[PDB]
């Protein structure tokens, strides 16, 4: 994969020119796009900017995020050929930093369950995950150094784990969702894909300009709390194998690891994730549901058809439970620096299954808002397996530092 | 002015038909548009829908709110002829309930301070206020029974007070802001204009389907707390005349009224509103600021230029102060049912002043998120003056009930 931090350092000392770096990505995309299909639109004439921390850095954008110079089709036939007037704030954050928007990456229709045609870089017979399938696949295949994705029902952490890339879903709202096609305003969050934790750090620093992302270095003797999210049921063998491998590597690196239970209130928040999601989606996608019902991707269409009756009453109740979860979850971070858990149920599903994978081990954290980071651990049958680092809300930097720590630990 | 509730009743019983109701607004609009200039575009072909509680109800929409059959120009030349593909969720809430979208009403550029050409129905030589100038004036001119507006730096309460109409800014996030051009995601809220509180109630019931808005009736002996927002400086005499008139009417009507001082924290929250507004506006309008800078209306453009230096640190600090303010404000409501305060600095400013009026007495509440309702009180020199009823967050229904009680109280 291409390292953003690496390119940065070389472009900074003058070893690599921005134009050469951008030409690099175009070639890397050309070399695998025909077999992976991660791009809805590759702008072959996209060029490097002459200044800024991200000059020479190519970035792929999940297609529910507005771009002014390229179409934003939402991964749906309903928005075929649709062209937004402006670039979404998140795209402008990259551009203002000198980045090059190299193209739009595939996304599941409206960021839901319906599979795209993108294939897993490690085995074209498997799913790259969702909802931001293209961004994960593109980074995993070494096409681009960075990519923006989104999440609602799940997290960028799952497709990242499937494709073996690093990724982070920042604290809720840190990255604006303006210009990001709404599925659920309570959940919708923007995330980043990269080669390693360090690349995510540099990427967020340039985008937000927040000092918390400046000077990040691997953590030391982290206090890790292992949670297996029992409420979501047992994971597949491959996933557990990856968790055990990560714990062992971390311990051998000086980290204190302990198994922890998640408070009952937190278990409840996980349960009502669907209520919040679907109730809000009915309002957010009202025009689509009313005017273009049969044009909505099958799986998403069905989920909506089945939740038309959700009441404002049970919705308010769900949010109430959600908040109680956030409070008590915070309490869990009074005795630990970061949590360590599964990134997915296991290895990426075969495409034949027509599934982007179950988001059950990702949904809670997206609802709570905590920053999560995927750390590739091992591979089973050639398919990547990862684990995710989760820190207290607003502690994004610490999440990245511990993830960086885990990476070095796994490298031994 | 036209009463939504009135229209509902008459149409329900059969006294009036939906087609006739709509025809009347088309006529009303045609009768004074050349005098008021409230509509960006009037869809003369709009007809009544067949079923629904709002069948026969013509509704005007502030032009930063997406509509799929009419342009959405954001009150800016940058978006001239811009045509969204979808209707915003709030527009869908209306359509689904059977309403008729009769047109788009003028809005200050990006819902900021730049004056539109719209004039005050009570006095063409005066401003109708902002940011939703057209919605307020159109309702004030008796063109339509309902209109949607937005608020960021102020509140629909101010233009409503300027034009002598009722209005409510529901609890933050009750009405989705998807498809509503973002100015500040922490403040952006949708509101309603109508003849009286009852009209707003029925309007919200139909839009949200929330039972709290069903069967609302005037409150009895409400516990009112009077706040004069001294942190906002001196108010104009006409404004105090109205507040006093309201207080006297309320007392005569059986309400218990006491003067109270808001906590320092609340004064602080009011102070940092601009910080949250402007820091976010730079992210929310990045594309416009970077690519079409000189095209941004003068006043907004100036407010942005002077704030390019706002840092994420002071922004975070500003939001800290905001939260404290909300926490301590809620405590105030343990003594009274609602708060009563000024809706504006005084009577509507002359158009010659090139100002939509100072939002200083509105901004605090929009940031806190509490539901606010405007209650017309009297007129000085022919210009309307109102007061606003504010309730605990989530207590929209009681704010309306209390506003209704006040209306009857003033009616003597």
Q: What is the DSSP string of B352-385?
A: GG------TTTHHHHHH---EEEEEEEEETTEEE
Contacts of B182 in chain A (CB under 8 A): 178
Contacts of B213 in chain A (CB under 8 A): none
**Reading across the β-sheet that carries A39-42, which strands appear in turn?**
A39-42, A100-105, A58-62, A146-151, A189-194, A166-169, A372-380, A383-391, A338-342, A223-226, A256-259
Q: Are strands B189-194 and B372-380 parallel, antiparallel or unpaired?
A: unpaired
CA separation for the pair A339, A113 (Å, rounded): 27
Listed in sequence order, the residues at least 6 apart from A412 whose beta carbon sits closer than 8 Å to its beta carbon are A249, A252
> A388 - beta bridge partners?
A341, A374
Q: CB of B283 within 8 Å of any CB in chain A?
A: yes
CA separation for the pair B230, B325 (Å, rounded): 16
Question: How many other C-beta atoms can be found within 10 angstroms of the C-beta atom of residue B10?
Answer: 16
Q: CB of B79 within 8 Å of any CB in chain A?
A: yes
- Choose among A239, A204, A208, A62: nearest CA to A147: A62
Structural contact between residues A380 and A217, judged by C-beta atoms closer than 8 angstroms: no
Contacts of B82 in chain A (CB under 8 A): 85
CB within 8 Å: A290 and B209: no
Alpha carbon of B352: minimum distance to chain A alpha carbons (Å): 34
CA separation for the pair A180, B178 (Å, rounded): 10
Q: Which of A176, A283, A313 sits opposite B176 (nearest CB)?
A: A283
CA separation for the pair B396, A173 (Å, rounded): 26
Q: Which of A86, A283, A291 sits opposite B89 (nearest CB)?
A: A283
- Choose among A234, A168, A186: nearest CA to A391: A168
**Closest residue of chain A to B292, computed from CA coordinates:** A86
Q: CB of B178 within 8 Å of any CB in chain A?
A: yes
Q: CB of B92 within 8 Å of any CB in chain A?
A: yes
**Resolution, expressed in angstroms to one decimal:** 2.0
Question: How many other C-beta atoms can be found within 10 angstroms of the C-beta atom of residue B408?
Answer: 14
CA separation for the pair A101, A90 (Å, rounded): 11
DSSP category for residue B288 = H
CB within 8 Å: A185 and B208: no
Contacts of B210 in chain A (CB under 8 A): 312
CB within 8 Å: A286 and B93: yes
Question: How many other C-beta atoms can be found within 10 angstroms of the C-beta atom of residue B18?
Answer: 21
Contacts of A87 in chain B (CB under 8 A): 286-287
Place of tokens 């009224």: B257
Length of chain A in terms of residues written = 412
Place of tokens 């591979």: A379
Contacts of B313 in chain A (CB under 8 A): 211
Listed in sequence order, the residues at least 6 apart from A264 whose beta carbon sits closer than 8 Å to its beta carbon are none
- Number of CB pairs, chain A paired with chain B, less than 8 A apart: 76
- Choose among B394, B371, B346: nearest CA to B126: B346
CA separation for the pair B57, B11 (Å, rounded): 10
Alpha carbon of A125: minimum distance to chain B alpha carbons (Å): 36
Listed in sequence order, the residues at least 6 apart from A30 whose beta carbon sits closer than 8 Å to its beta carbon are none
CA separation for the pair B53, B118 (Å, rounded): 30
- Helix, strand, or coil (residue A61): strand
Q: CB of A214 within 8 Å of any CB in chain B?
A: no
Q: Are strands B223-226 and B166-169 parallel, antiparallel or unpaired?
A: unpaired
Testing the interface with B: which of A81, A178, A186, A311 to mutate, by most B Cβ within 10 A? A178
CA distances from B222 to A361, B171, B228, B332, B412 (A): 49, 20, 19, 15, 16
- Choose among B148, B65, B51: nearest CA to B110: B65
Contacts of B291 in chain A (CB under 8 A): 68
Listed in sequence order, the residues at least 6 apart from A43 whose beta carbon sits closer than 8 Å to its beta carbon are A69, A70, A101, A102, A103
Which DSSP string corresponds to A217-233?
A: ---SS-EEEE---GGG-
Cis omega before residue B131 (within 30°)? yes
Length of chain B in terms of residues written = 412
Question: How many other C-beta atoms can be found within 10 angstroms of the C-beta atom of residue A334?
Answer: 7
**Closest residue of chain A to B288, computed from CA coordinates:** A86
Question: How many other C-beta atoms can be found within 10 angstroms of the C-beta atom of residue B46?
Answer: 18
Query: Tokens standing for A20?
Result: 């050469």
Structural contact between residues B153 and B172, judged by C-beta atoms closer than 8 angstroms: no
Long-range contacts of B206-210 (CB under 8 A, 24+ apart): B206/B52, B206/B53, B206/B54, B206/B93, B206/B94, B206/B97, B206/B98, B206/B99, B207/B90, B207/B93, B207/B94, B207/B97, B207/B175, B208/A312, B208/B93, B208/B174, B208/B175, B209/A312, B210/A312
Alpha carbon of B87: minimum distance to chain A alpha carbons (Å): 6
Structural contact between residues B190 and B150, judged by C-beta atoms closer than 8 angstroms: yes
CA separation for the pair B250, B244 (Å, rounded): 10
CA separation for the pair A168, A202 (Å, rounded): 12
Contacts of B284 in chain A (CB under 8 A): 89, 176, 178
Listed in sequence order, the residues at least 6 apart from B59 whose beta carbon sits closer than 8 Å to its beta carbon are B94, B99, B100, B101, B102, B144, B145, B146, B147, B148
Structural contact between residues A150 and A178, judged by C-beta atoms closer than 8 angstroms: no
CA distances from A31 to A19, A47, A142, A365, B120 (A): 18, 18, 10, 35, 63
Q: Which of B82, B89, B208 sits opposite A312 (nearest CB)?
A: B208
**Closest residue of chain A to B80, computed from CA coordinates:** A85
Contacts of A185 in chain B (CB under 8 A): 173, 176-178
CA separation for the pair B350, A228 (Å, rounded): 65
Question: How many other C-beta atoms can be found within 10 angstroms of the C-beta atom of residue B214?
Answer: 13
Residues 219-238 of A with CB under 8 A from B: none
Structural contact between residues B149 and B132, judged by C-beta atoms closer than 8 angstroms: yes
Report the Cα B217 to chain-centroid distance in Å. Answer: 22
Q: CB of A320 within 8 Å of any CB in chain B?
A: no
CA distances from A243 to A236, A248, A254, A344, A349 (A): 11, 9, 17, 11, 19
Give percent helix, percent strand, percent coil of chain A, each to the nearest 5.
Answer: 40, 15, 40
Give the CA radius of gyration of chain A.
20
Exposure string for A7-45, b = 16+ CB within 10 A, e = fewer? bbebbeeeebebeebbebbbebbeebbeebbbbbbbbee
The answer to whether the Cα torsion of A400, B287, A22, A383 is positive or negative is positive
CB within 8 Å: A92 and B286: yes
Quickly count helices (H) and strands (E) in chain A: 15, 11
Contacts of A312 in chain B (CB under 8 A): 208-211
- Choose among B6, B14, B42, B41: nearest CA to B27: B42
CA separation for the pair B124, B37 (Å, rounded): 10
Angle of the A197-208 helix axis to the A89-96 helix axis, nearest 10: 100
Q: CB of A208 within 8 Å of any CB in chain B?
A: yes
Q: CB of B302 within 8 Å of any CB in chain A?
A: no
Q: Which of A79, A87, A209 sits opposite B287 (nearest CB)?
A: A87
Q: Which CATH superfamily is domain B1-412 in?
A: Amidase signature (AS) domain (3.90.1300.10)
Alpha carbon of A239: minimum distance to chain B alpha carbons (Å): 37
Exposure string for B55-88, b = 16+ CB within 10 A, e = fewer? bbbbbbbbbbbbbbebbbbbbbebbeeeebebbb
CA separation for the pair A146, A137 (Å, rounded): 11
CA separation for the pair B149, B191 (Å, rounded): 5
DSSP category for residue B45 = T
Q: Are strands A166-169 and A372-380 parallel, antiparallel or unpaired?
A: antiparallel
Q: CB of A326 within 8 Å of any CB in chain B?
A: no
**Closest residue of chain B to A310, computed from CA coordinates:** B209
DSSP alpha helices (H): ranges in B3-119?
4-13, 18-36, 89-96
Place of tokens 């005007």: B60
Query: Tokens standing for B344?
Result: 């504006």
DSSP category for residue B349 = P
Angle of the A4-13 helix axis to the A18-30 helix axis, nearest 10: 150
């Amino acid at each position: 994969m291409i390292s953003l931090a690496d390119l940065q350092r070389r472009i900074e000392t003058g070893e690599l020119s921005p134009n050469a770096a951008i030409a690099q990505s175009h070639a890397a995309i050309e070399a695998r796009e025909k077999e992976v299909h991660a791009f809805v639109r590759h702008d072959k004439s996209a060029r490097a900017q002459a200044s800024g921390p991200l000059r020479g850095i190519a970035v792929g954008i999940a297609d529910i995020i507005d771009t002014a110079n390229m179409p934003t089709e939402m991964g749906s036939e309903i928005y075929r050929g649709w062209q937004p007037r402006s670039d979404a704030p998140v795209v402008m954050m990259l551009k203002r930093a000198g980045a090059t928007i190299i193209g739009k990456t595939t996304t599941t229709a409206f960021a839901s369950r319906d599979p795209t045609a993108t294939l897993n870089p490690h085995n074209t017979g498997h799913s790259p995950g969702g909802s931001s399938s293209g961004s994960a696949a593109a980074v995993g295949a070494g096409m681009i150094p960075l990519a923006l994705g989104t999440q609602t029902g799940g997290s960028v952490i799952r497709p990242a784990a499937y494709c073996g890339t690093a990724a982070i879903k920042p604290s809720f709202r840190m990255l604006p969702t303006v210009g990001v096609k709404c599925y659920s305003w309570a959940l919708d969050t923007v995330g980043l894909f990269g080669a390693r934790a360090e690349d995510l750090a540099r990427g967020l620093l340039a985008m937000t300009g927040r000092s918390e992302f400046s000077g990040i270095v691997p953590a030391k003797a982290p206090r890790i709390g292992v949670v297996r999210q029992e409420f979501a049921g047992a994971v597949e063998p491959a996933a557990e194998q990856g968790l055990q491998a990560a714990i062992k590597a971390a311990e051998r690196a000086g980290a204190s690891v302990q198994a922890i239970d998640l408070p009952e209130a937190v278990h409840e928040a996980w349960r009502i994730h669907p209520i919040i999601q679907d109730f809000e989606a009915h309002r957010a996608l009202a025009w689509e549901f009313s005017e273009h019902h049969d044009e909505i991707a099958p799986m998403l269409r069905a989920s909506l058809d089945a939740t038309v009756g959700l009441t404002p009453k049970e919705y308010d109740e769900a949010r109430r439970i959600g908040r109680r979860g956030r409070r008590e979850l915070g309490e869990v971070f009074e005795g630990v620096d970061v949590l360590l858990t599964y990134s997915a149920p296991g290895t990426a599903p075969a495409k034949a299954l027509a599934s982007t994978g179950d988001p059950r081990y990702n949904r809670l954290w997206t609802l709570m808002g905590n920053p999560c980071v995927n750390v590739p651990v091992l591979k089973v049958g050639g398919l990547p397996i990862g684990v995710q680092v989760i820190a207290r809300f607003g502690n994004d930097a610490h999440a990245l530092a511990t993830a960086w720590f885990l990476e070095d630990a796994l490298a031994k």
